[PDB]
């Protein structure tokens, strides 16, 4: 007299009970409490990197169907997100050990040059300093102490003379993202960088990675122009500019927006466009293009770029370091 007629209500109640609870926010404060284990629950961040013991993995919860590890066994997994926290995506490269200097800064952005031979085993990757040696006291002295024998770079790029003349060099270079881990191998190094994600180091005593750029190259686009809004994010760009004396590689910081930033650059490069376009250069079909601009990722405005020194063999180079970068690379836009 209890006609079975559909899925039993009681079973679905158990299964929707697990999907219901959302992540916790907005806890109220009592100085009469002055602290609670409940506040710890709101505050704790509950991260990865277990200890490889049979149960230590389960205690930490790395075996979770989600993209991020959550402990608690069956009780865990209710957040179904962490404010959109996304694990970093890593990119592994196989490089000659003579082309990449071991005493880099673990956080320097890297650029991979696209080889034009199929079935090739090893990749070709350039730092912002190696790029300087290729395209050619300040930068000059520190670049040379790091990379002597500039030929070992020019043979990785055998079309460099033709690519800078055709204004096609920039599209064979793809930005990859800051160094995270470097293995030292005498012949072929194994380099790892983070492509598209919150750049965090994998060291087991957990540490903070901050991306560095030589200060000769870094141009703060804001404060060069100097109500107005104060947004949250700020972005870092690169520019490959084909000029008279040679191609040049600079970095920019601002928070205005893509359509404004492209305008700001055409007035920041207005002297160098004229001087190049002057009697020095004649009109031709390909020689027209001036430069290309790409975005490397966002970071917190209002702060987050310090100044420091990079030391190597008793010489220093002024360098800027950005805190809490988020890698998000776009393709090049031509400016002229």
């Amino acid at each position: 007299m209890k006609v079975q007629g559909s899925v039993d209500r009681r079973r679905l109640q158990r299964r929707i009970a697990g999907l219901l609870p959302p992540p916790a926010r907005r806890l109220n404060i009592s100085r009469g409490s002055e602290f609670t284990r409940d506040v710890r629950g709101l505050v704790e961040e509950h991260a990865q990197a277990s200890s490889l013991s049979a149960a230590a993995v389960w205690r930490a919860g790395l075996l979770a169907p989600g993209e991020v590890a959550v402990a608690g066994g069956g009780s865990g997994g209710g957040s179904f997100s962490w404010s959109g926290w996304r694990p970093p995506v890593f990119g592994d490269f196989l490089i000659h050990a003579s082309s990449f200097n071991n005493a880099e800064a673990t956080g320097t952005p890297l650029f991979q040059f696209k080889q034009s031979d199929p079935f090739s085993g090893v990749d070709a990757v350039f730092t912002p300093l190696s790029l300087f040696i290729l395209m050619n006291g300040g930068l000059t002295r520190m670049a040379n102490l790091l990379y002597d024998s500039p030929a070992t770079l020019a043979d990785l790029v055998p079309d460099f003379g033709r690519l800078v003349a055709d204004r096609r060099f920039h599209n064979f270079i793809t930005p990859v993202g800051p160094l995270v881990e470097n293995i030292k191998s005498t012949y072929l190094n194994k380099i790892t960088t983070v492509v598209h994600g919150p750049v965090v180091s994998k060291a087991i005593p957990r540490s903070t990675v901050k991306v560095t750029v030589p200060q000769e190259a870094f141009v703060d686009l804001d404060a060069w122009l100097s109500l107005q809004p104060c947004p949250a994010d700020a972005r870092l760009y690169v520019a490959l500019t084909y000029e008279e004396a040679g191609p040049r590689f600079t970095f920019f910081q601002s928070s205005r927006g893509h359509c404004q930033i492209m305008n700001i650059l055409r007035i920041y490069y207005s002297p160098s466009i004229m001087h190049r376009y002057a009697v020095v250069q004649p009109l031709h079909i390909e020689e027209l293009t001036f430069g290309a601009v790409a975005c490397l990722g966002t970071f917190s405005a209002t702060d987050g770029w310090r100044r420091s020194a990079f030391n190597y063999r008793g010489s220093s180079l002024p360098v800027v370091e950005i805190d809490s970068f988020y890698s998000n690379v776009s393709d090049w836009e031509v400016i002229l």
């Binding site: 505050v43 704790e44 961040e45 991260a47 903070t208």
Partner: protein, 49 residues
């Protein structure tokens, strides 16, 4: 109230006033920051001293 007068002046009758006052609401905020390395090691039991 009023006063009685001897002149023929027009007399003010009984009067009464009604006034209303309302509340205002105020808000206070602040922001504090903490690193992830710090929040993460609150979760894990420590192995060595």
């Amino acid at each position: 109230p009023t006063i009685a007068h001897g002149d023929g002046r027009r007399p003010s009758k009984q009067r009464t006033f009604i006034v209303v006052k309302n509340c205002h609401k105020h808000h206070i905020s602040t922001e504090m920051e903490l690193s992830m390395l710090d929040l993460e090691i609150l979760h894990s039991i420590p192995e060595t001293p």
